[PDB]
Design a protein around this ligand. Structure first.
Ligand SMILES: COc1cc(-c2cncc(-c3ccc(C4CCNCC4)cc3)c2C)cc(OC)c1OC
Ligand SMILES: COc1cc(-c2cncc(-c3ccc(C4CCNCC4)cc3)c2C)cc(OC)c1OC
Ligand SMILES: COc1cc(-c2cncc(-c3ccc(C4CCNCC4)cc3)c2C)cc(OC)c1OC
Length: 286
């Protein structure tokens, strides 16, 4: 039988330290092809090892298709092939889209659903180990045509049965007090980052004719490409948190979301809500 492996690379949709991501086509269907830099080969190995251990399948996790290693004359080429989401990342989408109550909640609940699925150990034959993502951010979330999102990029993920993006790092990572021996610590780092993503999305929800412009977390207190020290001063020494605008307190949904954010940002990691509790809270809003 024929094994059709050719993928037509059509358009580069992302480029960075990690390599490039291309919209591609296989057997007439769009796929996304991440071509790894040499600098980032470890992320290919980590994601491949994870998927070789558990084939994750969830509406809110970016769908795996294949991992490929191809020998070249002097090099090794590493590709990760996934489903393609033409609307792009949440980061891109929020730049020039505003949201209503229903679409805001649909986005954030879908993220919480994907994150809870990663975090929760499932026993038995169709089960999975618990997984922490370790690099949650709006550029690592893709928007689907049905209004839900999916979480992408498991290159830093850790299982239980490169470092994260500095802007999204939790206080205990920045002050190096994280209990590296406790898997729950990594879950709590994800929850901190989830709270920041929630803030980013909520700013784009319209209420009473008002909306905030898209900004990344801490845009008003650190530079672009903030250093580790820059972040530690803000998050650990001064214990600053993203601002909640007054106008949110005129809207019941944004008021509830502000409370939720605050409970993801406690300095004490064990005080933060769990992904499952966030899901429950979101289902009771509106
Ligand atoms: C090796 O490389 C690649 C293979 C494929 C590919 C192409 N066509 C058919 C297949 C296939 C899948 C399953 C089965 C079996 C399963 C057990 N029993 C019944 C039948 C046979 C064949 C596969 C994997 C695609 C690639 O990319 C997109 C690819 O490169 C990454
Ligand atoms: C890697 O990705 C893709 C692979 C395929 C593909 C090609 N040929 C054969 C298969 C297959 C056929 C039979 C069985 C089994 C295994 C248990 N016992 C009986 C049934 C498994 C696999 C598959 C999935 C198709 C894709 O899309 C349409 C595809 O996604 C791009
Ligand atoms: C974050 O991580 C990953 C994302 C993808 C991925 C999947 N689908 C769609 C995309 C995308 C498509 C288009 C655009 C826009 C943005 C502005 N306008 C022009 C183009 C952005 C993003 C991307 C990046 C794939 C990965 O691997 C294969 C991947 O790594 C695991």
């Amino acid at each position: 039988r024929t094994v059709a492996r050719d993928i037509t690379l059509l358009e580069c949709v992302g480029k960075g330290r990690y390599g490039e991501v291309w919209r591609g086509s296989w057997q007439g269907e769009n796929v996304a092809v991440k071509i790894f830099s040499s600098r980032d080969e470890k992320s290919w190995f980590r994601e491949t090892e994870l998927y070789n251990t558990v084939m994750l399948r969830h509406e809110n996790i970016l769908g795996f298709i294949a991992s490929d290693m191809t020998s070249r004359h002097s090099s090794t080429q590493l590709w990760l092939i996934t489903h393609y989401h033409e609307m792009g990342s949440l980061y891109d989408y929020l730049q020039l889209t505003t949201l209503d109550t229903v679409s805001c909640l649909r986005i954030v609940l879908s993220i919480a659903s994907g994150l809870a699925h990663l975090h929760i150990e499932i026993f038995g034959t169709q089960g999975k180990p618990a997984i922490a993502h370790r690099d949650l951010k709006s550029k690592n979330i893709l928007v689907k045509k049905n209004g839900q999102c999916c979480i992408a990029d498991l290159g830093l993920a850790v299982m239980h049965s490169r470092v994260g993006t500095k802007r999204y790092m939790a206080p205990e990572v920045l002050d190096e007090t994280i209990q590296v021996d406790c898997f729950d610590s990594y879950k709590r780092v994800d929850i901190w980052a989830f709270g920041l993503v929630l803030w980013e999305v909520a700013r784009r929800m319209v209420s009473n004719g008002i909306v905030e412009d898209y900004k990344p977390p801490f845009y008003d207190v650190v530079p672009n490409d903030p250093s580790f020290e820059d972040m530690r001063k803000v998050v650990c020494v001064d214990q600053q948190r993203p601002n909640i605008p007054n106008r949110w307190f005129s809207d019941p949904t944004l008021t509830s979301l502000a409370k939720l954010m605050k409970e993801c940002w406690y300095q004490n990691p064990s005080a933060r809500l769990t992904a499952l509790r966030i899901k429950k809270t979101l289902t009771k809003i509106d």
